Curated annotation (Swiss-Prot):
Positions with a binding annotation for heme: 400
Portion of the parent chain present: 2 to 458 of 1049
Record protein name field: Bifunctional cytochrome P450/NADPH--P450 reductase
Source organism of the structure: Priestia megaterium (strain ATCC 14581 / DSM 32 / CCUG 1817 / JCM 2506 / NBRC 15308 / NCIMB 9376 / NCTC 10342 / NRRL B-14308 / VKM B-512 / Ford 19)
Function according to Swiss-Prot or TrEMBL: Functions as a fatty acid monooxygenase. Catalyzes hydroxylation of fatty acids at omega-1, omega-2 and omega-3 positions. Shows activity toward medium and long-chain fatty acids, with optimum chain lengths of 12, 14 and 16 carbons (lauric, myristic, and palmitic acids). Able to metabolize some of these primary metabolites to secondary and tertiary products. Marginal activity towards short chain lengths of 8-10 carbons. Hydroxylates highly branched fatty acids, which play an essential role in membrane fluidity regulation.
Effect noted on mutating residue 261 to E: Ineffective covalent modification of the heme macrocycle. Substantially slower FMN to heme electron transfer for the arachidonate-bound enzyme. Product distribution biased towards omega-3
Annotated region (Cytochrome P450), positions in chain: 1-457
Biotechnology: This protein is a target of protein engineering. Its selectivity-directing and activity-enhancing mutations have been extensively studied and the designed mutations allow this enzyme to act on non-native substrates and/or in order to enhance production of synthetically desirable end-products.
GN (gene name): cyp102A1
Result when mutating residue 74 to G: Higher activity in the hydroxylation of highly branched fatty acids
Induction: By pentobarbital. Expression is negatively regulated by repressor bm3R1 at the transcriptional level.
Positions contributing to (9Z)-hexadecenoate binding: 51
Phenotype upon changing residue 393 to H: High substrate-free turnover rate constant. Negligible substrate-induced spin-state and substrate-induced heme reduction-potential shifts on addition of saturating concentrations of arachidonate
Length: 457
């Protein structure tokens, strides 16, 4: 039962690269997985990886004593602006363990309670925007979610107000950031990056990094002009010592983590929120039940921390939006030693493996036959999901540090949304998923009718 591995078509020197020469590479990998099964080899010029789609292979991948986080090419290029921040550093880089030890406390339950007020502040700004639209007017979903989540990481993390709801155009940071990630996406499909032909692209990349470093500058400046102003994530970056050594972070690493958390703390959550709303409006029973639960639980003018915790059905909706379209759809791993996966595929020390999460999430042997159906009632019982069947937040010590932050935000927001408005899919919208690294619905528009429920000062 040692088997040889499936591969899609190669094309000489270009290997499998041409199969992923689209703006949607993940969705295309998904389609290759449907043809080829639970594992395929995937080559590009000098770099192999193997894409895994089934729970039974992925649970072995997720054994930490056999595999460790790999930087995929995407994360490798991303190092050019996020450096050795928590997302783009090797497990064995000194700064991974150090910053993880320093910053973990900032995502505890005490820290979540502390972030809560400022989460509401922004969420209230969202509702007010929507209350304030005229009759003829509609809502751009991903755009406002993006405004909401960026402002939330910024305020709760750093006490910096992007004021996205004061703007009709995306914030400068966003513009630069998307373009920097866009470049990152674009380099992945160049056969010859060397070619002098991409000259203002390389220059345009540098401009956008500098713009990100521009914003980071202001944040360390605004904080230099106060300090009492609050106690948050930035404080901990500046003042926290690594209990394992006594050392705090150095300034260079701190610029990296700030960039890392503004990026990773807004993009994925933003797509989760649009997806969830996409699914509510396509599925009347869920919409209705979410509204029933919001009305039942959100009894004070703004939500409390304890009240967001009580929104179980919203939790279920969120998990089922993440099942179907996990907004960070992939993470990379390499074998720490020669090892044999599912007793069928011998791997060499250093061989790379890719977890294809939307396929993992579509694994019939684990999830049942109705995997394409959006059915949040399948999450009624959380302990019934088998180990490593559900992984939108990655794996082990390298899993999402901001997981609770993300779910708390999206639960609160989605709850408030269904408390205050009815939603109409007035264009009968067709799902279109734009990929940067993360996933998000494109062109998703709705109309809200206000339930006209006052919203506390
Ligand atoms: C629902 C939204 C989110 C999703 C689906 C998501 C998903 C993920 C995934 C899949 C990973 C592992 C990546 C890998 O193994 O290469 C990760 C890591 C990480 N996430 Fe998130 N994330 C989300 C939101 C957030 C938020 C709100 C923050 C911060 C406020 C954040 C910060 C991080 C950090 C710092 C890491 C790297 C951890 C380490 O290796 O030490 N993420 N996330």
């Amino acid at each position: 039962t040692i088997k040889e591995m499936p591969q899609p078509k190669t094309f000489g020197e270009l290997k499998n690269l041409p199969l992923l020469n689209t703006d949607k590479p993940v969705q295309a990998l998904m389609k290759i997985a449907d043809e080829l099964g639970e594992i395929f080899k995937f080559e590009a010029p000098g770099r192999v990886t193997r894409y895994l789609s089934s729970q039974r292979l992925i649970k072995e991948a997720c054994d930490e004593s056999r595999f460790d986080k790999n930087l995929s090419q995407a994360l490798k290029f991303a190092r050019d602006f996020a450096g050795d921040g928590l997302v783009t550093s090797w497990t064995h880089e000194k700064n991974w363990k150090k910053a993880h030890n320093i910053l973990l406390p900032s995502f505890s339950q005490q820290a979540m309670k502390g972030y809560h007020a400022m989460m509401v502040d922004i969420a209230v700004q969202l509702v007010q925007k929507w209350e304030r639209l005229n009759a003829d007017e509609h809502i751009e979903v991903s755009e406002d979610m993006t405004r909401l989540t960026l402002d939330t990481i910024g305020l709760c993390g750093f006490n910096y107000r992007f004021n996205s709801f004061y703007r009709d155009q995306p914030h400068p940071f966003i513009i630069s950031m998307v373009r920097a990630l866009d470049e990152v996406m674009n380099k992945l499909q160049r056969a010859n990056p060397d070619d002098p032909a991409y000259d203002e692209n390389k220059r345009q990349f540098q401009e956008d990094i500098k713009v990100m470093n521009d914003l980071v500058d202001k944040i360390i400046a605004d904080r230099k002009a106060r300090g009492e102003q609050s106690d948050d994530l930035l404080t901990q970056m500046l003042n926290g010592k690594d209990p394992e050594t006594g050392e705090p972070l150095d300034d260079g690493n701190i610029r990296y983590q700030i960039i890392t958390f503004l990026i990773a703390g807004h993009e994925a959550t933003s797509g989760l929120l649009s997806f969830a709303l996409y699914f509510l409006v396509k599925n009347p029973h869920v919409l209705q039940k979410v509204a029933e639960e919001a009305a039942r639980v959100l009894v004070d003018p703004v939500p409390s921390y304890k009240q967001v915790k009580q929104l179980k059905y919203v939790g279920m909706v969120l998990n089922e939006a993440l099942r179907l379209w996990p907004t960070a759809p992939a993470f990379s791993l390499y074998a720490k030693e020669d090892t044999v996966l599912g007793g069928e595929y011998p791997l060499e020390k250093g061989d790379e493996v890719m977890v294809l999460i939307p396929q993992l999430h579509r694994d019939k042997t684990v999830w049942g036959d109705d995997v394409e159906e959006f059915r949040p009632e399948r999450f009624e019982n959380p302990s019934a999901i088998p180990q490593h069947a559900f992984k939108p937040f990655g794996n082990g010590q390298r899993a999402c540090i901001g997981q609770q932050f993300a779910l708390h935000e999206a639960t609160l927001v989605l709850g408030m949304m269904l408390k205050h408005f009815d939603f109409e899919d007035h264009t009968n919208y067709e799902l279109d998923i734009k990929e940067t690294l993360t996933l998000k619905p494109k062109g998703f528009v709705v109309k809200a009718k206000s339930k006209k429920i006052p919203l506390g000062g």
